[PDB]
Amino acid sequence: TYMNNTEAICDAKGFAPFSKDNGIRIGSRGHIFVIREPFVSCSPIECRTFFLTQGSLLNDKHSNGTVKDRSPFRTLMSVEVGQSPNVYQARFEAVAWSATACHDGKKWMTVGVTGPDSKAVAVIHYGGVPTDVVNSWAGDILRTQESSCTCIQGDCYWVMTDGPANRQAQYRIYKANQGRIIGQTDISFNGGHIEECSCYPNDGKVECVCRDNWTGTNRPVLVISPDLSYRVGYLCAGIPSDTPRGEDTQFTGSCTSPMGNQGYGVKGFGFRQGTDVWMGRTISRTSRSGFEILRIKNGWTQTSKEQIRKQVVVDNLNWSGYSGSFTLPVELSGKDCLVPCFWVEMIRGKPEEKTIWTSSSSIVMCGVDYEVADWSWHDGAILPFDI
Amino acid sequence: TYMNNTEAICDAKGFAPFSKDNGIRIGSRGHIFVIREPFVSCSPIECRTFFLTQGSLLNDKHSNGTVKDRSPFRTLMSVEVGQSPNVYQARFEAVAWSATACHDGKKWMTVGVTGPDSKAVAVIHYGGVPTDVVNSWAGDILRTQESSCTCIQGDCYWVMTDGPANRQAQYRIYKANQGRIIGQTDISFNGGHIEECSCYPNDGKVECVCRDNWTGTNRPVLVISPDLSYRVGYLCAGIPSDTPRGEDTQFTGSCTSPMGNQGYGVKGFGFRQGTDVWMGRTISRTSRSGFEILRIKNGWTQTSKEQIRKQVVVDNLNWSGYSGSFTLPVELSGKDCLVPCFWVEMIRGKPEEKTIWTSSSSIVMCGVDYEVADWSWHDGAILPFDI
Amino acid sequence: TYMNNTEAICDAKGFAPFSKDNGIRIGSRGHIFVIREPFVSCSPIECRTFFLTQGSLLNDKHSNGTVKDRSPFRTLMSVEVGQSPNVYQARFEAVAWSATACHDGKKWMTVGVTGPDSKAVAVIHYGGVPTDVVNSWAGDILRTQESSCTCIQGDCYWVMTDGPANRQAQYRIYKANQGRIIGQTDISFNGGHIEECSCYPNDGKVECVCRDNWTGTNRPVLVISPDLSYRVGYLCAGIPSDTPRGEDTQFTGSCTSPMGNQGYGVKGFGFRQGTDVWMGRTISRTSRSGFEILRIKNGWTQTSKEQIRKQVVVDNLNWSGYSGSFTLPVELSGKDCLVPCFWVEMIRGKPEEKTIWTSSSSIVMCGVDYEVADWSWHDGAILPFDI
Amino acid sequence: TYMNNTEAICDAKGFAPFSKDNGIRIGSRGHIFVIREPFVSCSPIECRTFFLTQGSLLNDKHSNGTVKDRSPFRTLMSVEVGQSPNVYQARFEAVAWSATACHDGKKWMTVGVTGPDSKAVAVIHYGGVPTDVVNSWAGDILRTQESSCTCIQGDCYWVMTDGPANRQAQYRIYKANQGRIIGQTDISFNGGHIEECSCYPNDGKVECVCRDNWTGTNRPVLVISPDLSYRVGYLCAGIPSDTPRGEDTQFTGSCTSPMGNQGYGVKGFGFRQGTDVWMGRTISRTSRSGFEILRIKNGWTQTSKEQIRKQVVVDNLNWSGYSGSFTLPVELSGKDCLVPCFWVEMIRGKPEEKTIWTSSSSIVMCGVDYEVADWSWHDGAILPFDI
Ligand SMILES: CC(=O)N[C@@H]1[C@@H](O)C(C/C=C/c2ccc(C)cc2)=C(C(=O)O)O[C@H]1C(O)[C@H](O)CO
Ligand SMILES: CC(=O)N[C@@H]1[C@@H](O)C(C/C=C/c2ccc(C)cc2)=C(C(=O)O)O[C@H]1C(O)[C@H](O)CO
Ligand SMILES: CC(=O)N[C@@H]1[C@@H](O)C(C/C=C/c2ccc(C)cc2)=C(C(=O)O)O[C@H]1C(O)[C@H](O)CO
Ligand SMILES: CC(=O)N[C@@H]1[C@@H](O)C(C/C=C/c2ccc(C)cc2)=C(C(=O)O)O[C@H]1C(O)[C@H](O)CO
């Protein structure tokens, strides 16, 4: 039975801790992969944490980290949400140095991209077996969400980018059923730049808040119809949520176009709340440290800078990183709307650390109809390690 | 199908060993969490040992134990009853530095409390996903049973405390269905103090024997109706079962009010046997060492000090600690009454030990229609460790 | 659905390797329990290796082995046949320093005996939960098979001994359903001594070949009816199969009475083949080394010393030990008779070894309608270990 | 429900990465078996990697590798495709120093061969239990595919060799149902030599591309009917695919007979594509390094040397080794043809390496209707190890 993810995103006042893996603390003595991008997606029965590994373990010479991001050993695997990415619990998912995964109600579909920059291949997996493929269409590091993809009534949608990391690149929407690609679209966005989309379902369409690594410190937004017709632009709120970025004051709200001089960014997320938006951002405007989440009134649809809520989850004395969106299956939340959730990656080691290695632990938050107090559920690991 | 836990508690003569995890002996070389409160609850299919971890492993720098009880890394996880709390077998349950868990017949519901003392949040999980929330209602370390909660015909009940550890605090009963809070009550108990309740079902109501950390060396008792109306008071028996506590002689039996001067205590349990009670207590009146279990005639309903049975399970040359109650699903025991069971936590390391670290192993006992001989199934670990 | 184990034992010509765990070789670097008695029993779906642990791991101070056989930390756990007894795969079964287990077709029933020598308790588990009990009835180290017990049409039978290890002791047959004891019998056997029975089903009755630790170098045999009426005596074959024991020549075949002067013995097994018997024995008449299996014509029913087959499985340059019987569920073998199988324990370390520790690996053989060549599938471990 | 593997092999243009285990990199700190022959077969629900172990772990004295190939400790076990052969995830399969495995749609059947060279036994397992046997029929290291065997409509077929490794030997086809041998054939092939067959299903028959260790640098091919009547010969393509071997030029294409002087070889594979063939081979003509896969027009049926496609998967600066074939169940690929897949073993340590030990990691590729770019997904391990 397929998942109906046609409902509205629940209107949440605040966010409660879902899980914490303590991966890096644990891996000081145990056998934990050195990972990145601990993103989360849910089947109708359980949620899982997907992650990329370098095939190495914490506290081992192979965590040496001079190793390349897009290496032949990079792989997507997964554990149950909250469990650390240890070797024993781990489920192999795909050969990938960039990935997205989502479950459609029947089986999991994942997408690993691997091979060479000039002609990468992205393998689609369905039920733990390759079913289809996409080749670099522009010859420049083909890549995708690094966050849950989105399944609406049996068909799954995700977004990919093939092109330069700075200047103008190319962007497409893909649509699969049972692991077979059945539709695709080019996304026109001159001046605009899209990467590492954080997507969720809403009112029967797919909404993403992505990353502009070229020109904007506000985040791109697109909204995908099931016919692959789409709207695209920026998150209207007059508050910048990329990293790095400038003061909110020094700031302009653009539904239309990138806003700040800054290049570069980090993966982030945001949830549409009617007209308001829950936006996430690092606390530091310059480094990936601390993590908070602001609610802005009419932020989805206007250049608003009216904060209704500020909720800290990682304090600014602590490292954060990537963040992403995902929804709770109705068939678990019990609710009648789609409970919005998100994960926060917390990175330790290089570059900000004395260590030969770099990994991250995660922490997951969900929905909830109440204000939740500010706290920091930071990583915790005592660096450096035996090495 | 929901669990009918409406039956009577079986009338047991003695207690047989259910399981022993040997966690700490095992963790001298293996990868075992450093835990506390190894409590037990049962689904209609298996029993599990829940525990709080600090995200660290035995024999690792992170077991350093200068780390705080209510840390951001504290989590509830679980294994099958008898298995050690090792990293590989472990199932993530919740972000919690205080917890209760119970299964209702369909799925597990757990409750982790985390965040800051002044405004903690308690997240309710159902089927391994947050479904609801409770915020500190009195701003003073919100907390709960540290032992199995109680599900009667689809609805689960547990008890929480928000307030000072010594003086007067506040106490409430909560009632959930399918992970949704559907009722709550304030518990009036001036002069009285309640913490770490050990609860089981009986005659369709919920009976707990809790901890008074203020004023009494006898244990509070409450009895909850499914309408959240309740009786509350003390365990009548004229024998003290808190720790620390005075001689049984020097002692008075109060159904009504706290009895000894002593402040402080430890989590304990007791089972109503018609009018008699099975009460547990440490052997040492002063330290948490040794563990025995006495049956007192008319102890539930009178200031009785008539011992029918004394049964040792941990000898007084050995460390004990927390203890708690839980019931065996009829759908496993095969019986027509609810077989009473309990766990005994055995603590090693700080403060009574030379070590940088503190954890505990457990041992579980059940029901049974026979006198069982005295023995000690103590922890066993050879301290200190490689460190 | 219960198991019908009413069929005849298949008439097998030879024995094929089923599994080898390599536990001790593996545990030189991995996390393997230090075990004894790796016996095997089968559900209608899989076979498992049960074992007693001391709660310790190989290559760890706790394997120190000055620790007592009947310690408070001794436990029965289990893995899938062929897997090593590692900590991660292990399933907790019971608190036991002596045990038997069998599956009846619906669930597993195990029996762990623990507590003090003068008043041990034997806990019966059904579906992984205690359901019943037996107390020492003679106050002298209550004990049982250390090998698969036997389930015939929903009811399971095993044998226990309470008494001295040398001189005359006491012996009983027990009969359970769904973990509830429903019948028991005293076994009259003056002059005779019974221990560590290896039992299998056959023609609707239960046949065992046990251990005489008092007076006989031939093995006791009993045959249990479902009404707990029984025949008992010795294995007629005119060849001794206990260890230690004398030359086969220097030997007499007694259906009736113990045969050689020797005291002591080891756990062994044998399968009735119409009138013939497959008997197992160590190769060395004096030490537990090497292991072979002889077929003797009319050995079940006569003082025969006619060898039809000799098949070596462990050569006499290698350590062996306990051995035991078990049957393959028809619902797996596919056959119409019960395929006879047996396990051989191979012991390393103390007393015959330089080491602080003692454990064993195993190797399992089955049925088969063909002569299988002689070989040695010995333990393999390179002693001593890092220590 | 049995598997219908009667369909045609899909016509694939190129091959996409399925999985990579990173076993050896991972085993630098974790607990990974030292293995060989990481072959792959699929049930209707999941694919698994089977492997032979020596019972030892990487970075342990027992990996010492002076140990013999056909040792008493050699065993077949298995994990989910992509997972490393670690001790915790591992499923015991059989006592084997040579093996094949295939699933028929209901259960897995495996075949381990063990015992002595002069009279080896091959045990057939069905549903994880021995069901049948084959003894050395020629007294000279009985052996088999080391790759997936083949199940067509409930009946499984594989090929075995009993005889010399060089000169003429003997070859047979076996046919089992539910683990019971129900047919066998001798394969007449004078001048010809067959070993380590890589087989898949196609048009309702079984096609293999095997290894000639005697005389030919082209690969033997046979095609088995369900009646065990067969055709046999060589792969016609005028290009040599054994290792070692000579230039393609210096080369002749023989459908009939072995082609080059060279003795010796390595296990390899090939897929019939109508009349064309996908053939695999090491890049180095002399050593087992690098791995590519060529498509040759009319190569199945003619002495053709027309390359349509060359696709590298391991570059010639890196070690390769054994390779083998397997099919994707329709009941997973979703397609209407059988998607051809293959695994490549990558060997590290002795003989080409400074180390006391030898193991291999693997990498798996599948079907796909597109050209996939050249890359190298080589092993990755940093030799030598702590030792
Ligand atoms: C496919 C791919 O390259 N995607 C990139 C992804 O890998 C990461 C993540 C890094 C993991 C990592 C780990 C250890 C070290 C020492 C260094 C890096 C980042 C990032 O911004 O952090 O950027 C993506 C990217 O380049 C941009 O989007 C611009 O196009
Ligand atoms: C939420 C919370 O704080 N609950 C407390 C709970 O954590 C523990 C257990 C301790 C684990 C631990 C472990 C290592 C070390 C070095 C120190 C402590 C105890 C206890 O009495 O032992 O008391 C609860 C408590 O404070 C009282 O009930 C009074 O209100
Ligand atoms: C309940 C109980 O004591 N059963 C005994 C059982 O434990 C064992 C097995 C020993 C394991 C072990 C391991 C490490 C060391 C250093 C020493 C011993 C043996 C045996 O004959 O080997 O004998 C049973 C027995 O005493 C007799 O049947 C006579 O009555
Ligand atoms: C049953 C059996 O012996 N089959 C052989 C098989 O074992 C292997 C694989 C070796 C594993 C290995 C591992 C570590 C070391 C130090 C040495 C070897 C090879 C091979 O060609 O590589 O050849 C098979 C063979 O002899 C031929 O087909 C000729 O008949």
JSON list of C-alpha atoms in Angstrom, two decimals, chain B residues 255-367:
[
{"chain": "B", "resi": 255, "resn": "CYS", "atom": "CA", "xyz": [-0.85, 3.85, 56.26]},
{"chain": "B", "resi": 256, "resn": "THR", "atom": "CA", "xyz": [-1.10, 7.58, 56.40]},
{"chain": "B", "resi": 257, "resn": "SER", "atom": "CA", "xyz": [2.09, 9.56, 56.82]},
{"chain": "B", "resi": 258, "resn": "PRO", "atom": "CA", "xyz": [5.84, 9.53, 56.53]},
{"chain": "B", "resi": 259, "resn": "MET", "atom": "CA", "xyz": [7.47, 7.62, 59.58]},
{"chain": "B", "resi": 260, "resn": "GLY", "atom": "CA", "xyz": [11.17, 8.15, 60.21]},
{"chain": "B", "resi": 261, "resn": "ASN", "atom": "CA", "xyz": [13.28, 11.24, 60.57]},
{"chain": "B", "resi": 262, "resn": "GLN", "atom": "CA", "xyz": [15.67, 10.28, 57.63]},
{"chain": "B", "resi": 263, "resn": "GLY", "atom": "CA", "xyz": [15.65, 12.26, 54.44]},
{"chain": "B", "resi": 264, "resn": "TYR", "atom": "CA", "xyz": [16.69, 10.74, 51.15]},
{"chain": "B", "resi": 265, "resn": "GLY", "atom": "CA", "xyz": [15.98, 7.32, 49.78]},
{"chain": "B", "resi": 266, "resn": "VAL", "atom": "CA", "xyz": [16.30, 5.04, 46.79]},
{"chain": "B", "resi": 267, "resn": "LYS", "atom": "CA", "xyz": [13.87, 3.68, 44.22]},
{"chain": "B", "resi": 268, "resn": "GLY", "atom": "CA", "xyz": [12.07, 0.59, 45.49]},
{"chain": "B", "resi": 269, "resn": "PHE", "atom": "CA", "xyz": [9.04, -1.56, 44.84]},
{"chain": "B", "resi": 270, "resn": "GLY", "atom": "CA", "xyz": [6.41, -3.71, 46.46]},
{"chain": "B", "resi": 271, "resn": "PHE", "atom": "CA", "xyz": [3.59, -6.03, 45.47]},
{"chain": "B", "resi": 272, "resn": "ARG", "atom": "CA", "xyz": [0.15, -6.21, 47.06]},
{"chain": "B", "resi": 273, "resn": "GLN", "atom": "CA", "xyz": [-0.79, -9.78, 47.93]},
{"chain": "B", "resi": 274, "resn": "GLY", "atom": "CA", "xyz": [-4.44, -9.56, 48.90]},
{"chain": "B", "resi": 275, "resn": "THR", "atom": "CA", "xyz": [-3.78, -7.82, 52.20]},
{"chain": "B", "resi": 276, "resn": "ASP", "atom": "CA", "xyz": [-0.14, -8.89, 52.58]},
{"chain": "B", "resi": 277, "resn": "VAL", "atom": "CA", "xyz": [2.72, -7.23, 50.73]},
{"chain": "B", "resi": 278, "resn": "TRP", "atom": "CA", "xyz": [5.96, -8.29, 49.13]},
{"chain": "B", "resi": 279, "resn": "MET", "atom": "CA", "xyz": [8.33, -5.43, 49.93]},
{"chain": "B", "resi": 280, "resn": "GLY", "atom": "CA", "xyz": [11.88, -5.08, 48.69]},
{"chain": "B", "resi": 281, "resn": "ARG", "atom": "CA", "xyz": [14.74, -3.35, 50.42]},
{"chain": "B", "resi": 282, "resn": "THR", "atom": "CA", "xyz": [18.50, -3.17, 50.54]},
{"chain": "B", "resi": 283, "resn": "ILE", "atom": "CA", "xyz": [19.98, -5.28, 53.30]},
{"chain": "B", "resi": 284, "resn": "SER", "atom": "CA", "xyz": [22.13, -2.47, 54.70]},
{"chain": "B", "resi": 285, "resn": "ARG", "atom": "CA", "xyz": [19.97, 0.14, 56.44]},
{"chain": "B", "resi": 286, "resn": "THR", "atom": "CA", "xyz": [22.51, 2.79, 55.46]},
{"chain": "B", "resi": 287, "resn": "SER", "atom": "CA", "xyz": [24.15, 1.92, 52.15]},
{"chain": "B", "resi": 288, "resn": "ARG", "atom": "CA", "xyz": [22.77, 0.50, 48.91]},
{"chain": "B", "resi": 289, "resn": "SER", "atom": "CA", "xyz": [24.20, -2.98, 49.39]},
{"chain": "B", "resi": 290, "resn": "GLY", "atom": "CA", "xyz": [22.63, -6.42, 49.42]},
{"chain": "B", "resi": 291, "resn": "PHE", "atom": "CA", "xyz": [18.97, -6.89, 48.48]},
{"chain": "B", "resi": 292, "resn": "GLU", "atom": "CA", "xyz": [16.22, -8.91, 50.06]},
{"chain": "B", "resi": 293, "resn": "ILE", "atom": "CA", "xyz": [12.48, -9.21, 49.77]},
{"chain": "B", "resi": 294, "resn": "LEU", "atom": "CA", "xyz": [10.13, -9.71, 52.72]},
{"chain": "B", "resi": 295, "resn": "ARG", "atom": "CA", "xyz": [6.49, -10.80, 52.78]},
{"chain": "B", "resi": 296, "resn": "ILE", "atom": "CA", "xyz": [4.47, -9.13, 55.52]},
{"chain": "B", "resi": 297, "resn": "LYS", "atom": "CA", "xyz": [1.06, -10.36, 56.61]},
{"chain": "B", "resi": 298, "resn": "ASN", "atom": "CA", "xyz": [-1.62, -7.72, 56.28]},
{"chain": "B", "resi": 299, "resn": "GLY", "atom": "CA", "xyz": [1.14, -5.30, 55.36]},
{"chain": "B", "resi": 300, "resn": "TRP", "atom": "CA", "xyz": [-0.81, -3.61, 52.60]},
{"chain": "B", "resi": 301, "resn": "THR", "atom": "CA", "xyz": [-3.67, -2.73, 54.92]},
{"chain": "B", "resi": 302, "resn": "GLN", "atom": "CA", "xyz": [-2.23, -2.70, 58.45]},
{"chain": "B", "resi": 303, "resn": "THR", "atom": "CA", "xyz": [0.70, -1.52, 60.51]},
{"chain": "B", "resi": 304, "resn": "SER", "atom": "CA", "xyz": [1.81, -5.18, 60.55]},
{"chain": "B", "resi": 305, "resn": "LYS", "atom": "CA", "xyz": [5.32, -6.41, 61.18]},
{"chain": "B", "resi": 306, "resn": "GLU", "atom": "CA", "xyz": [4.60, -10.13, 60.75]},
{"chain": "B", "resi": 307, "resn": "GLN", "atom": "CA", "xyz": [7.17, -11.68, 58.33]},
{"chain": "B", "resi": 308, "resn": "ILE", "atom": "CA", "xyz": [5.88, -14.77, 56.53]},
{"chain": "B", "resi": 309, "resn": "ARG", "atom": "CA", "xyz": [8.94, -14.89, 54.16]},
{"chain": "B", "resi": 310, "resn": "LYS", "atom": "CA", "xyz": [12.50, -13.33, 53.91]},
{"chain": "B", "resi": 311, "resn": "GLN", "atom": "CA", "xyz": [14.29, -14.16, 50.54]},
{"chain": "B", "resi": 312, "resn": "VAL", "atom": "CA", "xyz": [17.76, -12.87, 49.73]},
{"chain": "B", "resi": 313, "resn": "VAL", "atom": "CA", "xyz": [18.79, -12.24, 46.12]},
{"chain": "B", "resi": 314, "resn": "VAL", "atom": "CA", "xyz": [21.89, -10.12, 46.66]},
{"chain": "B", "resi": 315, "resn": "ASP", "atom": "CA", "xyz": [24.00, -10.65, 49.78]},
{"chain": "B", "resi": 316, "resn": "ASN", "atom": "CA", "xyz": [25.17, -7.74, 51.92]},
{"chain": "B", "resi": 317, "resn": "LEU", "atom": "CA", "xyz": [28.78, -8.07, 50.79]},
{"chain": "B", "resi": 318, "resn": "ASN", "atom": "CA", "xyz": [27.60, -6.83, 47.43]},
{"chain": "B", "resi": 319, "resn": "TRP", "atom": "CA", "xyz": [26.30, -3.64, 45.86]},
{"chain": "B", "resi": 320, "resn": "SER", "atom": "CA", "xyz": [22.69, -3.15, 44.93]},
{"chain": "B", "resi": 321, "resn": "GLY", "atom": "CA", "xyz": [20.69, -0.04, 44.08]},
{"chain": "B", "resi": 322, "resn": "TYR", "atom": "CA", "xyz": [17.47, 0.88, 42.32]},
{"chain": "B", "resi": 323, "resn": "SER", "atom": "CA", "xyz": [14.73, -1.76, 42.11]},
{"chain": "B", "resi": 324, "resn": "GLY", "atom": "CA", "xyz": [11.40, -1.74, 40.30]},
{"chain": "B", "resi": 325, "resn": "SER", "atom": "CA", "xyz": [8.20, -3.54, 39.45]},
{"chain": "B", "resi": 326, "resn": "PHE", "atom": "CA", "xyz": [6.66, -4.94, 36.32]},
{"chain": "B", "resi": 327, "resn": "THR", "atom": "CA", "xyz": [4.12, -7.52, 35.31]},
{"chain": "B", "resi": 328, "resn": "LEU", "atom": "CA", "xyz": [4.23, -10.49, 32.93]},
{"chain": "B", "resi": 329, "resn": "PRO", "atom": "CA", "xyz": [1.65, -10.27, 30.17]},
{"chain": "B", "resi": 330, "resn": "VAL", "atom": "CA", "xyz": [-0.92, -13.03, 30.53]},
{"chain": "B", "resi": 331, "resn": "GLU", "atom": "CA", "xyz": [-0.32, -13.55, 26.79]},
{"chain": "B", "resi": 332, "resn": "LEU", "atom": "CA", "xyz": [3.17, -14.96, 27.76]},
{"chain": "B", "resi": 333, "resn": "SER", "atom": "CA", "xyz": [2.87, -16.32, 31.40]},
{"chain": "B", "resi": 334, "resn": "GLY", "atom": "CA", "xyz": [-0.07, -18.43, 30.27]},
{"chain": "B", "resi": 335, "resn": "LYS", "atom": "CA", "xyz": [-1.57, -17.88, 33.73]},
{"chain": "B", "resi": 336, "resn": "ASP", "atom": "CA", "xyz": [-4.88, -16.18, 34.50]},
{"chain": "B", "resi": 337, "resn": "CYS", "atom": "CA", "xyz": [-3.36, -13.71, 36.96]},
{"chain": "B", "resi": 338, "resn": "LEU", "atom": "CA", "xyz": [-0.59, -11.12, 36.42]},
{"chain": "B", "resi": 339, "resn": "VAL", "atom": "CA", "xyz": [2.75, -12.61, 37.51]},
{"chain": "B", "resi": 340, "resn": "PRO", "atom": "CA", "xyz": [4.60, -10.01, 39.58]},
{"chain": "B", "resi": 341, "resn": "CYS", "atom": "CA", "xyz": [8.26, -9.41, 38.67]},
{"chain": "B", "resi": 342, "resn": "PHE", "atom": "CA", "xyz": [11.03, -7.00, 39.62]},
{"chain": "B", "resi": 343, "resn": "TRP", "atom": "CA", "xyz": [14.51, -5.92, 38.67]},
{"chain": "B", "resi": 344, "resn": "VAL", "atom": "CA", "xyz": [17.44, -5.09, 40.93]},
{"chain": "B", "resi": 345, "resn": "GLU", "atom": "CA", "xyz": [20.11, -2.67, 39.74]},
{"chain": "B", "resi": 346, "resn": "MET", "atom": "CA", "xyz": [23.65, -3.38, 40.95]},
{"chain": "B", "resi": 347, "resn": "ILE", "atom": "CA", "xyz": [26.00, -0.39, 40.87]},
{"chain": "B", "resi": 348, "resn": "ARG", "atom": "CA", "xyz": [29.79, -0.42, 40.49]},
{"chain": "B", "resi": 349, "resn": "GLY", "atom": "CA", "xyz": [32.37, 2.35, 40.49]},
{"chain": "B", "resi": 350, "resn": "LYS", "atom": "CA", "xyz": [31.84, 5.81, 42.00]},
{"chain": "B", "resi": 351, "resn": "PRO", "atom": "CA", "xyz": [31.09, 6.74, 44.76]},
{"chain": "B", "resi": 352, "resn": "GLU", "atom": "CA", "xyz": [31.80, 3.58, 46.80]},
{"chain": "B", "resi": 353, "resn": "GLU", "atom": "CA", "xyz": [34.64, 2.49, 44.30]},
{"chain": "B", "resi": 354, "resn": "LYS", "atom": "CA", "xyz": [38.06, 3.59, 43.12]},
{"chain": "B", "resi": 355, "resn": "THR", "atom": "CA", "xyz": [37.10, 4.22, 39.49]},
{"chain": "B", "resi": 356, "resn": "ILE", "atom": "CA", "xyz": [36.48, 7.22, 37.23]},
{"chain": "B", "resi": 357, "resn": "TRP", "atom": "CA", "xyz": [33.18, 5.77, 36.17]},
{"chain": "B", "resi": 358, "resn": "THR", "atom": "CA", "xyz": [29.84, 4.43, 37.34]},
{"chain": "B", "resi": 359, "resn": "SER", "atom": "CA", "xyz": [27.46, 1.95, 35.77]},
{"chain": "B", "resi": 360, "resn": "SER", "atom": "CA", "xyz": [25.31, -0.97, 36.87]},
{"chain": "B", "resi": 361, "resn": "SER", "atom": "CA", "xyz": [24.31, -4.46, 35.83]},
{"chain": "B", "resi": 362, "resn": "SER", "atom": "CA", "xyz": [20.94, -5.97, 36.60]},
{"chain": "B", "resi": 363, "resn": "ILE", "atom": "CA", "xyz": [19.16, -9.11, 37.66]},
{"chain": "B", "resi": 364, "resn": "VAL", "atom": "CA", "xyz": [15.46, -9.96, 37.20]},
{"chain": "B", "resi": 365, "resn": "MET", "atom": "CA", "xyz": [13.07, -12.15, 39.25]},
{"chain": "B", "resi": 366, "resn": "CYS", "atom": "CA", "xyz": [9.53, -13.48, 38.74]},
{"chain": "B", "resi": 367, "resn": "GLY", "atom": "CA", "xyz": [6.38, -14.71, 40.44]}
]
